[PDB]
UniProtKB/Swiss-Prot annotation:
Residue intervals on the Extracellular side: 116-250
Domain of life, per lineage: Eukaryota
Binding-site list for L-glutamate: P85, T87, R92, A138, T139, E186
Positions glycosylated per UniProt: N199
Posttranslational mods: Mass spectrometry data suggest the protein is N-glycosylated at five distinct sites.
UniProt family annotation: Belongs to the glutamate-gated ion channel (TC 1.A.10.1) family. GRIK3 subfamily.
UniProt protein name: Glutamate receptor ionotropic, kainate 3
Residues of the full protein shown: 434 to 805 of 919
Function in brief: Ionotropic glutamate receptor that functions as a cation-permeable ligand-gated ion channel, gated by L-glutamate and the glutamatergic agonist kainic acid. Binding of the excitatory neurotransmitter L-glutamate induces a conformation change, leading to the opening of the cation channel, and thereby converts the chemical signal to an electrical impulse. The receptor then desensitizes rapidly and enters a transient inactive state, characterized by the presence of bound agonist.
Quaternary data: Homotetramer, and heterotetramer with GRIK4 or GRIK5. Can form functional heteromeric receptors with GRIK2. Interacts with PRKCABP. Interacts with NETO2.
Note: The postsynaptic actions of Glu are mediated by a variety of receptors that are named according to their selective agonists. This receptor binds domoate > kainate >> L-glutamate = quisqualate >> AMPA = NMDA.
Subcellular compartments: Cell membrane; Postsynaptic cell membrane
Native source organism of the sequence: Rattus norvegicus (Rat)
Tissues expressing the protein: Expressed in the olfactory bulb (at protein level). Expressed in the deep cortical layers, dentate gyrus, reticular thalamic nucleus, mammillary bodies, pons, and cerebellum of the adult.
Length: 250
């Protein structure tokens, strides 16, 4: 049977490809994670149907501990694979399985160009420049859970001021372009955006380190096969090639 792949529109990972007509099925999509999926389907010899996650979320918990997003789709066995920039986290590992990472990254800062700012520290110890993160994203959770001084402080700011947190990267990137606002997000998106928007830039370096993995329901037989396939793609340099294909723009 074809595998059900849950995913989520997110540049440059998964996008509707441009067309004069209306496309349907898998042919609708293009992007880094679509190329990854094609590589995985070939190596492992499965067929698949792409389905965008209904609630358009990656996956977070509520106060009662219930999951939404692609994480939930896997938990309920409504999808066999999550092929997306799904950040590997301690908490998510308790609910689903991940392949080994296919991409490594970290939290960093998106901000308009040309300022005294050079680091998170510069950002926390001042007040003129607002800053925030996507609400309930892996990046926000990092600041919430942190015990580091400068990040407990930043979490204090972004959690008190109820305009600091944005609904998604799209809105957050809007804010950096219209207001005096710095977005806390993942370095993969920042590199993509700053290659295409020469008025934006990354502030400082990576403040943590993490990876993206293919999500499967806990105990899936495919997890280990996907890990083997990712290792093969690494050996063949195809993750390098795929990244340069979809990260290119100053
Ligand atoms: C592009 N994204 N940025 C994020 C962030 O948390 O900064 C999200 C994270 C997740 O899986 O929650 N990885 C994909 C999303
Ligand atoms: Cl076409
Ligand atoms: Cl769909
Ligand atoms: Cl999370
Ligand atoms: Zn190949
Ligand atoms: Zn089941
Ligand atoms: Zn290479």
């Amino acid at each position: 049977r074809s595998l059900i792949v849950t995913t989520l529109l997110e540049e440059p990972f998964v996008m509707f490809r441009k067309s004069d007509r209306t496309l349907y099925g898998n042919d609708r999509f293009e992007g880094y994670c679509i190329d990854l999926l094609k590589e995985l389907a070939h190596i492992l010899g499965f067929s698949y149907e792409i389905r965008l996650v209904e609630d358009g979320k990656y996956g977070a918990q509520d106060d009662k501990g219930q999951w939404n997003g692609m994480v939930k789709e896997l938990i309920d066995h409504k999808a066999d694979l999550a092929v997306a920039p799904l950040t590997i986290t301690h908490v998510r590992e308790k609910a689903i399985d991940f392949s080994k990472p296919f991409m490594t990254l970290g939290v960093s800062i998106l901000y308009r160009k040309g300022t005294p700012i050079d680091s998170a520290d510069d950002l926390a110890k001042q007040t003129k420049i607002e800053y925030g993160a996507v609400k309930d994203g892996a990046t926000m959770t990092f600041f919430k859970k942190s015990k580091i001084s400068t990040f407990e402080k930043m979490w204090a700011f972004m959690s008190s001021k109820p305009s600091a947190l944005v609904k998604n990267n799209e809105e957050g990137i809007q804010r950096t372009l219209t207001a005096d606002y710095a977005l806390l997000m993942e370095s993969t998106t920042i590199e993509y955006i700053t290659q295409r928007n020469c008025n934006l830039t990354q502030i400082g370096g990576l403040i943590d380190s993490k990876g993206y993995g293919i999500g499967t329901p806990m105990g899936s037989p495919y997890r280990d096969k996907i890990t083997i396939a990712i290792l093969q793609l690494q050996e063949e340099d195809k993750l390098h090639i795929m990244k340069e294909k979809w990260w290119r723009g100053c």
